[PDB]
RNA sequence: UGCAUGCCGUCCGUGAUUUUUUACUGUGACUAAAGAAGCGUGACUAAAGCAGUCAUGACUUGAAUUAGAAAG
RNA sequence: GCCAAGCUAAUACAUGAACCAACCGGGUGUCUCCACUGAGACGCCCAGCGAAUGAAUGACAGUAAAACCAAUGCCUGCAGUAACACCCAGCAGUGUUGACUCAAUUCAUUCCGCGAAAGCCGGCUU
């Protein structure tokens, strides 16, 4: 094959670790619909692999569907707050907290940094489902699993 | 000594962490190997649990694989040509994982002749082997020139070895243009 | 690197008094967990009264007079646990360690025939070098060639004299189990259904012989027979039936009046 | 137990022609050769009765290239003919 | 010589104490190979090969069981089609 | 070692098709002792303790039970 | 707190075990045979646990009737049909999890850590 200029925008060549793309007799186990070889996996907790993961061309280590990152621990929900960073977003969780002495509630919120794979295109104000993973940066502990 | 803890870092609020404990051995770091090209010289390091890490200081030979043929050979290293971190590493000829090197191509030529009967007993399994098999012009051009490009796949500062794989496909063209 | 155990921090089931010592014997690593075991010194000094103190317990144990699973044990900190067989041939005593209806450790007397086998729960299955399937047990045993139908929830009947497996009982909808942990420990029931929640704890719903309903986590049930009437092991006196607290107190008062 | 067919091993189909086997065979034998196991060879004598050619030689002697073994095949040629009649009907039936 | 006994040539030291019999002191000989020791070593090799032989037999029985259960399923299938 | 083989509603895996939470409330699970509540017990009573009671041993002795924020 | 010389133990340190003793695979040379390539010897290598790099396996689970070539299997043309050119005619066609680049297996090249303590007692020539 030739070099895809739409993808190779770095000083080092971008490739998937799991498979070898330069194979003369590729195996149908990891053969994509468009001929090429692509590695993808099924994560566990009743979630579906997006079609862009199986049939796309993006290279993303730290993607739960196309890399060695696994999902284990907590599953949470939140609303998208900011999308200014590259391949990572900020989400907000809003909740009510009870005070016993004054039998009443007060509004509180929390913020989390979440890695977003190129399979999704969330916008500010949208709702997402996220899952816990191993530490990926100084602050990132979650990965986007579905966009609603 | 060197530590790997997060205590000295700033908080995301910009505030300063007040440390109320001394440094612990369980969070240490060590000085880098800075492996160079030359006659073999290694140094053992006793790591946690009693196991040993082999710190390579100089290397000049390695085990390199031709992925298409699923074989491997032991060959001599000649030069360091490219490095994505910085070209000051190329100037000093430093060996690290994922750097591009040039290796001797003579052992690979000998294997090709003895396996396919092609120069670049009655039982002719060669005719069977050449059926539905072809070689890339980019590789054969280097095999005739004497040296062939390869990518280091091991971590010399952790295991003491410099192993790798030959460049083929679109990855070969990517680095050829970056060297042109 | 902890090697002590304060008496206030020791498990309540050991029944050690708070006023008669600062420390308790700390069990060593072994077949059973520290929080779910009963050290040999506690068995021989308390419970059975063959030893009056720790000095006499050491005399008995270090001679090799106590056998656990057909093997002499010489350590008073050896952790003994659920379904273990303890034999003292010089005295002529054989017991199995079980849970009574109140969740406490109980020693059940055994006949010579019944002392040759023990029930083993599978907890893991993996492949060893040379493609050998291995089954890991709740008491740390490693069986090198289990039956091809073995699953992680099943129970294995194991002959300890010949070191050979004899039978396999599967975890199904119509089987009898005993609870080994939680608030319902010691109760014997029958499986009604099992709820599967991937990634979290599965929940089992059980039915007692008297029709009472209760539930536990799937990791706390232990298969012991194909139905409530054909059990492959001997159970304690109460047969795993929880009794009403109001009713139980009334009978105890009546019995005291008649006894005197 | 006396049976018509007799089993011959370890003759090799690709190395020996058809003419070679009856050279060892006394006669009146129907030959069939198998390739799933090279050694296999079934010899159904016309009038075997007491298999003199099987009780004699067999394990004691050796065929060309390799030693040979013979055992009673416990197979009746009549049953094969019965299946042959049914099979031909099936071929006609389709 | 190689076959000569060495216990006879060990050096004895004489100790004299007043009003007591003489004391003769000789070392205990180390690395003295006796027929009791020779039999002990040879048993170790014999049981090591025995244990490995038993393990291979256990493997054959397991593979026999797997194959036998596998052939009964296809035999049962052929029985259904025949009837 | 074929020593073998036969005499409509469900179960389980995978694909296709489209959507309702949170909160409150009822149960249930999972949750160290010591401390608090309290069932039994004439340590001479009590503050205590978990023991002891009765005729080559028995009581197939006893040591019941509860509450503990919020979040999950 | 210390120096030099002379003696001497090991379960300290170092070295080191052929045949008994198997199954299975990869690469290659001389003999027999078939056909005009295929099979079997024979030789010759190399194949342990663990570690490193590379290549495969680590399943399937969206449609059905039939022709034509070359190579094969079984019947005397397509019935019958785990797989496999003999020694083994069933000596793995089947690891686990919610999920794995994990467990384990085969192939190529490379380490350059791995005693049967070369041990100690006891009971009856073993």
Swiss-Prot record, chain B:
Keyword Ribosomal protein set for record: yes
InterPro entries: Ribosomal_eS8, Ribosomal_eS8_CS, Ribosomal_protein_eS8_euk, Ribosomal_Se8/biogenesis_NSA2
Cellular compartments per GO CC: cytoplasm; cytosolic small ribosomal subunit; nucleolus
Keyword Ribonucleoprotein tagged: yes
Molecular function GO labels: structural constituent of ribosome
UniProt record, GO biological process: maturation of SSU-rRNA from tricistronic rRNA transcript (SSU-rRNA, 5.8S rRNA, LSU-rRNA); translation
UniProt keyword terms in alphabetical order: Ribonucleoprotein, Ribosomal protein
Family: Belongs to the eukaryotic ribosomal protein eS8 family.
Alphabetized PANTHER family for the sequence: 40S RIBOSOMAL PROTEIN S8 (PTHR10394)
Descriptive protein name: Small ribosomal subunit protein eS8
Gene source species: Leishmania major
Lineage: Eukaryota, Discoba, Euglenozoa, Kinetoplastea, Metakinetoplastina
UniProtKB/Swiss-Prot annotation, chain E:
Top-level taxonomic group: Eukaryota
Stretches with biased composition (Basic residues): 73-83
Coiled coil: none
Mod. after translation: Ribosomal protein S6 is the major substrate of protein kinases in eukaryote ribosomes.
Assigned protein family: Belongs to the eukaryotic ribosomal protein eS6 family.
The protein's role, per its UniProt record: Component of the 40S small ribosomal subunit. Plays an important role in controlling cell growth and proliferation through the selective translation of particular classes of mRNA.
Name the UniProt record assigns to this protein: Small ribosomal subunit protein eS6
Organism of this sequence: Leishmania major
Encoding gene per record: RPS6
Residues of the full protein shown: 151 to 233 of 249
């Amino acid at each position: 094959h030739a070099v895809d200029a739409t993808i190779q925008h770095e000083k080092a060549y971008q490739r998937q670790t799991a498979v070898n793309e330069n194979m003369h007799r590729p195996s149908r186990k990891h053969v994509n619909k468009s001929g090429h070889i692509r590695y993808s996996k099924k994560i566990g907790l009743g979630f579906k692999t997006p079609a862009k993961a199986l049939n796309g061309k993006y290279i993303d280590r730290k993607c739960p569907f196309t890399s060695n990152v696994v999902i284990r621990g907590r599953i949470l929900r939140g609303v998208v707050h900011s999308t200014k960073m590259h391949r990572t977003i900020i989400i907000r969780r809003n909740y009510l907290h009870f005070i016993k002495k004054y039998q009443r509630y007060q509004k509180r919120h929390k913020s989390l940094a979440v890695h977003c794979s190129p399979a999704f295109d969330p916008k500010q104000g949208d709702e997402v489902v996220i899952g816990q993973c191993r530490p990926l940066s100084k602050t990132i502990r979650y990965n986007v699993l579905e966009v609603v | 000594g060197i530590v790997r803890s997060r205590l000295h870092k700033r908080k995301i609020t910009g505030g300063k962490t007040k440390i109320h404990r001394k440094r612990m051995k369980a969070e240490l770091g060590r000085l880098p190997a800075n492996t160079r090209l030359g006659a073999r010289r290694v140094s053992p390091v006793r790591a946690r649990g009693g196991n040993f890490k082999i710190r390579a200081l100089r290397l000049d030979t390695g085990n390199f694989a031709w992925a298409s043929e699923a074989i491997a050979h032991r060959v001599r290293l000649l030069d360091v040509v490219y490095n994505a971190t910085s070209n000051e590493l190329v100037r000093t000829k430093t060996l690290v994982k994922n750097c591009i090197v040039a290796v001797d191509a003579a052992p690979f030529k000998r294997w090709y002749a003895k396996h396919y009967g092609i120069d670049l007993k009655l039982q002719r399994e060669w005719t069977r082997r050449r059926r539905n098999h072809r070689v890339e012009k980019a590789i054969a051009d280097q095999l005739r020139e004497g040296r062939v490009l390869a990518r280091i796949t091991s971590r010399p500062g952790q295991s003491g070895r410099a192993d790798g794989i030959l460049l083929e496909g679109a990855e070969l063209q990517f680095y050829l243009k970056r060297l042109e | 690197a902890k090697k002590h155990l304060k008496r206030l921090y020791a498990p309540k089931d050991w029944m050690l008094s708070k006023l008669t010592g600062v420390f308790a014997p700390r069990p060593r690593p072994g077949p059973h967990k520290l929080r779910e075991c009963l050290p040999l010194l506690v068995i021989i000094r308390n419970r059975l009264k063959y030893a009056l103190n720790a000095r006499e317990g050491e005399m008995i144990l270090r001679q090799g007079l106590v056998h656990v699973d057909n093997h002499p044990r010489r350590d008073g900190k050896y952790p003994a646990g659920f379904m273990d067989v303890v034999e003292i041939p010089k005295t002529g005593d054989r017991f199995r360690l079980m849970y009574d209806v109140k969740g406490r450790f109980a020693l059940v007397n055994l006949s010579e025939a019944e002392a040759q086998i023990k029930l083993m729960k599978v907890v893991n299955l993996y492949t060893a070098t040379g493609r050998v399937p291995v089954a890991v047990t709740h008491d740390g045993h490693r069986i090198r060639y289990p039956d091809p139908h073995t699953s992680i929830g099943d129970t294995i009947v194991y002959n300890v004299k010949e070191k050979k497996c004899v039978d396999l009982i599967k975890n199904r909808q119509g089987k009898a189990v005993i609870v080994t942990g939680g608030a319902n420990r010691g109760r014997i029931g029958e499986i009604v259904k099992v709820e599967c929640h991937p990634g979290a704890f599965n929940i089992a719903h059980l039915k007692d012989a008297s029709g009472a309903e209760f539930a536990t986590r799937a990791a706390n049930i232990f298969v012991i027979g194909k139905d409530l009437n054909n059990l492959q092991v001997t159970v304690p006196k109460q047969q795993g039936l929880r009794m009403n607290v109001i009713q139980e107190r009334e009978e105890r008062l009546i019995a005291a009046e008649a006894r005197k | 137990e006396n049976s018509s067919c007799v089993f011959v091993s370890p003759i090799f189909r690709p190395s020996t022609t058809k003419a070679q086997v009856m050279e060892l065979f006394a006669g009146v034998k129907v030959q069939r050769l198998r390739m799933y196991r090279q050694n296999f060879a079934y010899a159904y004598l016309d009038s075997p009765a007491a298999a003199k050619k099987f009780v004699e030689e067999k394990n004691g002697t050796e065929f060309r290239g390799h030693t040979l073994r013979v055992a009673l095949s416990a197979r009746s040629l009549e049953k094969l003919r019965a299946r042959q009649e049914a099979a031909n009907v099936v071929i006609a039936a389709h | 010589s190689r076959t000569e006994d060495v216990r006879k040539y060990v050096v004895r030291r004489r100790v004299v104490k007043s009003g007591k019999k003489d004391r003769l002191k000789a070392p205990k000989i180390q690395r003295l190979i006796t027929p009791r020791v020779k039999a002990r070593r040879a048993k170790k090799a014999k049981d090591a090969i025995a244990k490995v032989r038993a393990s291979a037999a256990e493997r054959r029985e397991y593979l026999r069981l797997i194959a036998s259960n596998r052939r009964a399923l296809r035999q049962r299938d052929h029985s259904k089609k025949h009837t």
